[PDB]
Amino acid sequence: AEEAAASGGLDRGLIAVGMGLAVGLAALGTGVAQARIGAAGVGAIAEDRSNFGTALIFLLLPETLVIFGLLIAFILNGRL
Amino acid sequence: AEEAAASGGLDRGLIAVGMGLAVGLAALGTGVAQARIGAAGVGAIAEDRSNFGTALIFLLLPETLVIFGLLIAFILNGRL
Amino acid sequence: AEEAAASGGLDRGLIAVGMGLAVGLAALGTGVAQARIGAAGVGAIAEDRSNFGTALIFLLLPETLVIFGLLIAFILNGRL
Amino acid sequence: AEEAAASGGLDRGLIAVGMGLAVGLAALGTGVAQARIGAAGVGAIAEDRSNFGTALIFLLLPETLVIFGLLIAFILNGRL
Amino acid sequence: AEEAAASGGLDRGLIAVGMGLAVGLAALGTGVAQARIGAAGVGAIAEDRSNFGTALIFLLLPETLVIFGLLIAFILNGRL
Amino acid sequence: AEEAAASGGLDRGLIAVGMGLAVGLAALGTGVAQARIGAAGVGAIAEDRSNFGTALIFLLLPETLVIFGLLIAFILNGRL
Amino acid sequence: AEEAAASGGLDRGLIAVGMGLAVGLAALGTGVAQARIGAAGVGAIAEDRSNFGTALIFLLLPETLVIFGLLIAFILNGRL
Amino acid sequence: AEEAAASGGLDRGLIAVGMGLAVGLAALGTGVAQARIGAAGVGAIAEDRSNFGTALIFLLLPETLVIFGLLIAFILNGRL
Amino acid sequence: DDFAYLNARVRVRRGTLLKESFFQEALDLSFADFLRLLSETVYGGELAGQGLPDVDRAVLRTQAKLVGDLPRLVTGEAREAVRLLLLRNDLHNLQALLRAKATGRPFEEVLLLPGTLREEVWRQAYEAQDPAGMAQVLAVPGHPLARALRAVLRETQDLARVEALLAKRFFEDVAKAAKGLDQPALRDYLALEVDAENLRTAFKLQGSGLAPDAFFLKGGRFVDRVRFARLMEGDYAVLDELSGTPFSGLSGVRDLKALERGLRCVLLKEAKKGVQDPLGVGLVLAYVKEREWEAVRLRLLARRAYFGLPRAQVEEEVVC
Amino acid sequence: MEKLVLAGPKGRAKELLQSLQQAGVVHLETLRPEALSAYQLSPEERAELRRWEAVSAGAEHTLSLLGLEAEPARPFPEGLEAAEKALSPIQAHAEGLTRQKQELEEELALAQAYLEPLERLAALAHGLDKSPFLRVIPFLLTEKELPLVEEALRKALEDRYLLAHEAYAGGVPALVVVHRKEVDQAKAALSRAGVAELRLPGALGELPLSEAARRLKERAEAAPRELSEVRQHLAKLARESASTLQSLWTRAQDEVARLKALEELASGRFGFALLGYVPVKAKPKVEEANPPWVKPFELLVSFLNTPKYGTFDPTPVVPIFFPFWFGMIVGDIGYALLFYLVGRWLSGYVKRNEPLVIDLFALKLKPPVLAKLVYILNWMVFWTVVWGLIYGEFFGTFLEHLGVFGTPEHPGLIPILIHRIDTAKTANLLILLSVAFGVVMVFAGLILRAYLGLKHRHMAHFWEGVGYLGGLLGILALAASYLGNLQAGWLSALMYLGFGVFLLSVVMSSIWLMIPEIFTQAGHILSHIRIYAVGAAGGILAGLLTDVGFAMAERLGLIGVLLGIVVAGVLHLLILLLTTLGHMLQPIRLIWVEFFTKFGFYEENGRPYRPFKSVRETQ
Helix, strand or coil, X not given: CCCCCCCCCHHHHHHHHHHHHHHHHHHHHHHXXXXXXXXXXXXXXXXXXXXXXXXXXXXXXXXXXXXXXXXXXXXXXXXX | CCCCCCCCCHHHHHHHHHHHXXXXXXXXXXHHHHXXXXXXXXXXXXXXXXXXXXXXXXXXXXXXXXXXXXXXXXXXXXXX | CCCECCCCCHHHHHHHXXXXXXXXXXXXXXXXXXXXXXXXXXXXXXXXXXHCHHHHHHHHCCHHHHHHHHHHHHHHHCCC | XXXXXXXXXXXXXXXXXXXXXXXXXXXXXXXXXXXXHHHHHHHHHHHCCCCHHHHHHHHHCCHHHHHHHHHHHHHHCCEC | CCCCCCCCCHHHHHHHHHHHXXXXXXXXXXXXXXXXXXXHHXXXXXXXXXXXXXXXXXXXXXXXXXXXXXXHHHHHCCCC | CCCCCCCCHHHHHHHHHHHHHHHHHHHHHHHHHHHHHHXXXXXXXXXXXXXXXXXXXXXXXXXXXXXXXHHHHHHHHCCC | CCCCCCCCCHHHHHHHHHHHHHHHHHHHHHHHHHHHHHHHXXXXXXXXXXXXXXXXXXXXXXXXXXXXXXXXXXXXXXXC | CCCCCCCCHHHHHHHHHHHHHHHHXXXXXXXXXXXXXXXXXXXXXXXXXXXHHHXXXXXXXXXXXXXXXXXXXXXXXXCC | CCCHHHHHHHHHHHHHCCCHHHHHHHHHCCHHHHHHHHCCXXXXXXXCCCCHHHHHHHHHHHHHHHCCCHXXXXXXXXXXXXHHHXXXXXXXXXXXXXXXXXXXXXXXXXXXXXXXXXXXHHHHHHCCCCHHHHHHHHHCCCCHHHHHHHHHHHHCCCHHHHHHHHHHHHHHHHHHHHHCCCCHHHHHHHHHHHHHHHHHHHHHCCCCCCXXXXXXXXXXXXXXXXXXXXXXXXXXXXXXXXXXXXXXXXXXXXXXXXXXXXXXXXXXXXXXXXXXXXXXXXXXXXXXXXXXXXXXXXXXXXXXXXXXXXXXXXXXXXXX | CEEEEEEECCCCHHHHHHHHHHHCCXXXXXXXXXXXXXXXXXXXXXXXXXXXXXXXXXXXXXXXHHXXXXXXXXXXXXXXXXXXXXXXXXXXXXXXXXXXXXXXXXXXXXXXXXXXXXXXXXXXXXXXXXXXXXXXXXXXXXXXXXXXXXXXXXXXXXXXXXXXXXXXXXXXXEEEEEECCCHHHHHHHHHHHCCCCCCCCHHHHHCCHHHHHHHHHHXXXXXXXXXXXXXXXXXXXXXHHHHHHHHHHHHHHHHHHHHHHHHHHHXXXXXXXXXXXXXXXXXXXXXXXXXXXXXXXXXXXXXXXXCCCCCCCCCCHXXXXXXXXXXXXXXXXXXXXXXXXXXXXXCCCCCCCCCCCCHHHCCCCCCHHHXXXXXXXXXXXXXXXXXXXXXXXXXXXXXXXXXXXXXXXCCCCCCCCCCCCCCHHHHHHHHHHHHHHHHHHHHHHHHHHHHXXXXXXXXXXXXXXXXXXXXXXXXXXXXXXXXXXXXXXXXXXXXHHHHHHHHHHCHHHCCCCCCCCHHHHHHHHHHHHHHHHHHHHHHHHHHHCHHXXXXXXXXXXXXXXXXXXXXXXXXXXXXXXXXXXXXXXXXXHHHHHHHCECCCCCCECCCXXXXXXXXXXXX
16 A cells, blocks of 8 residues: 555455565575575685676576565555 | 554554564565675685675675565555 | 553554564574574684674674664554 | 553453564574574683683673563553 | 463453463573583583583573563463 | 363363463474484483483473473463 | 263363363474484494493483373363 | 364364364474484494384384374364 | 584584694604603593604594594484595595405504494404405495495406595595585585695696596586696696685695695685584584694604604694 | 792782782892893703602502592692602502502403303313314304304315304304314305304413313402402502602692792793892791671682772672572472572581582582582572572562452461462562662663773773763663653653763764664663563562462362372472572673673673682682
């Protein structure tokens, strides 16, 4: 919903319970992923400075999942 | 739900109950994601003082995961 | 909730469930971040007494998360 | 006052679940966070008795999360 | 609720469900900390009796966490 | 209900169901913690054949929690 | 335990659920507690044929949680 | 008693729900336990290629806990 | 399983490790004063005679009870992780044992300490009279170093070859298992051990006319086939392009002794900063390199003192 | 006059000098390290030191062998010559006795193992083990191995071999007897099965079986009698002369320390150094110069006199501990009542333990010297149990009453039925009464913390320490708005806004580069509140376990319940102890929030000087 008054929906409340799951689990997961690449990145600098770039390209990838999740939650709930 | 003031309808309650799942699960994810890089991160300094900066900038990224989960929650809660 | 001390509505009880999660879970995440980084800090002091501080600055960063949970609970139960 | 009953109520029971999350989750994170610090603490006293002070300060440190969680639960449940 | 000599009531019963989560979780965290440290304490005394006292002090510390979870729980249910 | 209660029915039964969660979780934390150490502990007994006992006593310490939590549920579920 | 009419009844069910929990939960904690210590301990006898007696006394200490839960469960939900 | 909610109503309903938890948890704690002993057991057959009999029996010991929980529940709801 | 008790047992032990300031004192001492000093330490606690055979023995026996007793004290997933570390000290025993059976020489004048294969496994193996039977007796503790041995023994019965293909196949075996047991601390180290091995295989076999690709096995960080080929021609300009690795210090160095010194000091360093990761195998990792390196300096300081060698000949090799 | 040499630290130059000046030593002049150089020990001096170490070590060696080691504080002045002549006969005698003893013990251990097999084996081929015509080979087989071995030998050796066995209770020692020159073949057959030849250590192994078997039977009978004697002679020697060694040990050790002192001072390893002169008379004189409260205070005076920083006395610690510490004991039915008894066993004596002998002569599990030190501690425990018995009637104010609550002083069925500390109003005030002391301690630590930076003259500590104390006021302010709501705490709802300005406004004057970290300063405030609350409430919980341990938890309560509940009560005792000892660690856990964070206290993250836990161990 809106913070302003311009929404109402008996259906929507149920949609909020179900959608809270998807964002929350995607952020959990994306984070756990992120950490492995970040620890790996510590190693990457250690091995060779020049290919800090390699850590960067892999590291972008789990971000896509939360971001995708945020858009799904808005469409299903909060679009109006 | 409501932003200002406590919920006064059963429907407002039920939405609040769902929305909590997203900020909780995220909140946990920021936590786990910080630890693997964070523990290593001390090691970054240790090995190479100059590239202490490299460890921090990775750690910062999981903070993003909570703020994205909050924004969905902040908007969605106000009305049904 | 914002109104709860010895009685309250059924509705109010429901906002208290959902918002309760957000803070509790931050504390949870803080503790996991702390476990790994704290444990690493015990290595650092052991080796050299003087760089207790580096461990402390890295550690100071997951505290921010516990404070973030508080604010979500605070706003959503009822705006200051 | 803050958090009390004498008669209970239907409203109270839902209030009781909500306040229960905060203490329970915080203590779980305190327990693990301590546990790791506690393992590493064997090592601090062992190398030198000149870092033995440092080990005591580390051990006290994960308590703050649980204390903080007691407080959020009392406040929410005793503010009008 | 009450805990004078009985706690019977459908309403109170709701409070009983709510609190037991908090005890549960707090007790769970205690289990991981206390045991690991206790094993660690038996190694300390076996090599060196000059650290027999540190080993004992560490054991006690996780006991506070499980009692916290009981005390909150009693409080919501009619107090002590 | 119990043989030291004389209040049964639907009312005692909700409390019994609900409070039952706490002991079960106290057993879970106790469980996982006793097992890890106990396995390492076989090597302890193996080494110390005159101080074999020490190993035995450390095992007993996590159990203290489960049993303590049962006794708390006993009070709550019957005090007559 | 028993099933009858004088170890049976509707009155008996309220007792049976609570007391039944006591074996279940005690059983939960016992399975995990016993497994690692028992896994390693049977192994010792395979390696070293002088640890078999030690392994058997050692094994019963985690067995104690189910035996305890069982005594509560049996007596309270016995006859009368 | 039995598991019903129309052969005793609301009073009965509580027994059925609570008893399910004892079995469900008996099954979780056993299931995980079986894995640990299995994992260690492989070593024992490789090491001693005729001490096949020792590995199978050690494994049997966690099964005991599910036969314990699952029967207790069954006898009690078998009364009616 | 689990390192929870075991790490804790090692943390008490890290207390009685020999700090840098002992070796500093020891150089200033004669052999008589060295002997009084040595007896304070835990290696000193196994001492049985003033002379050289006895110093070598007190050192070894200290390593046998405080370090070689670690794999027994754990089982399973813990045990495989700890085991890989222990395995290098077991390979040293194995290569010598395999050589006593084959060339018919006595059981004696070999390295024996417990690790993963016990003393009795080495005696039963010795007394075995078929190489295949010798191999099943070794396969009893369970480890990747059996599986490595077993394949090489199928191709050949020639001593020099079994030694080389076993070592090559063994580090390859180690690497795959280790990658699958995770942790950043172990991974960084593993990479260095393989990189160091690669350099070192190239040095030992230098100028034998052989293939340079045979000295490179996966696990690397910055080294490759071409550096090996140039190195094999005798060119050390390859080490002068090697930076971004902690072998930055090998640049402008061309003596085999300085080069190899360098690799052992680098490996020491990685492990010493693994105590910012003490969880799991990290701490044990640091503990084994330090007990090994310590033991080595007391043996060099004892030799240096007894025979009155020049101070600078050993002062440099007793510090990194 | 006698020349005397003095050292101290640079920081206490004036305080050390004033004290020495008073003490006896006169003519105190300062000496810098360059002056101390060139006064390193001459080679002769080093030889005395080497020799003093040998005597020290040499005693430790003799005295350990003889029995137990004990280090007294009583030396006996003697020469180099006198001490070495003392030491040489006893070390020699004892070395000799222990060697016999080891040989006697190893012989027994082998003979106990291998007499029965060698007897069996010898018997089987009696008088045919010393013949050249026949060859015998002994070896052990288990029931399992016996068939394989027989097959292997039979195929290898045809039917002109003799395999005989005779039992012994378990496996069989077997003997194969074969012709001379058929030895290699015979051996080869055992080796293929994996069985090998049994040979014993030393001459016995090499002797014919019949000789070896007769002699082993003889050694097992003789050894235990001779072992007894050697152990006896050794015991007497300890008994008579354990003291001689101990007194040499102490004296030798004092001389080693003196000569080490001069080598350190000589390399200019003490920063403040003095020279001065004492007459022979003055030489002793220099070295020479309500119990709960007074008693620990008189020992603490030794730490009053040595300061180390801007710190104040470590003595505020002890009266903060005592109220809070006594109030962890609050039972009156089988908690504080049982615990009364415990006090007497540590402040008297028991023999109901084994490692503990009689306490009255200073003999415990703890070392005999440590046990004499912890007399004071044991008293301080005795004072805690006593006062806890009084605070057990304080608790019984909230229980017992004949009208206010529904439980008499002693019901006539069983003492105590149901606790009546389950009143909601009653639990809250005892928690809030307890909280008030925790607050008093927050002010006392941060007020000293500021005074610390004023008199240690580092403004950065002064400024930070003042500011953090503003936050306490905000913390309490905010609470009142929730404990009294708007009925009370509407007298601090507007001061709170400004209390928040004070937290930050003084801290920023030092700047500081981690402003967030101030959160953790607010964490320390919060703990004093929660710990005192835990100290009351968790204390009260201790009592409420005693419900089901020495209070009605059988039938409806009746006469029989009194002596029936004790089944669960004893089991409950060890459980109860473990959790309540956990509370008694709260006083020190509280103290350390402030003590190691330099709140008018010496410590601050490391640094020499003990945690108060260890100080109070002996006091």
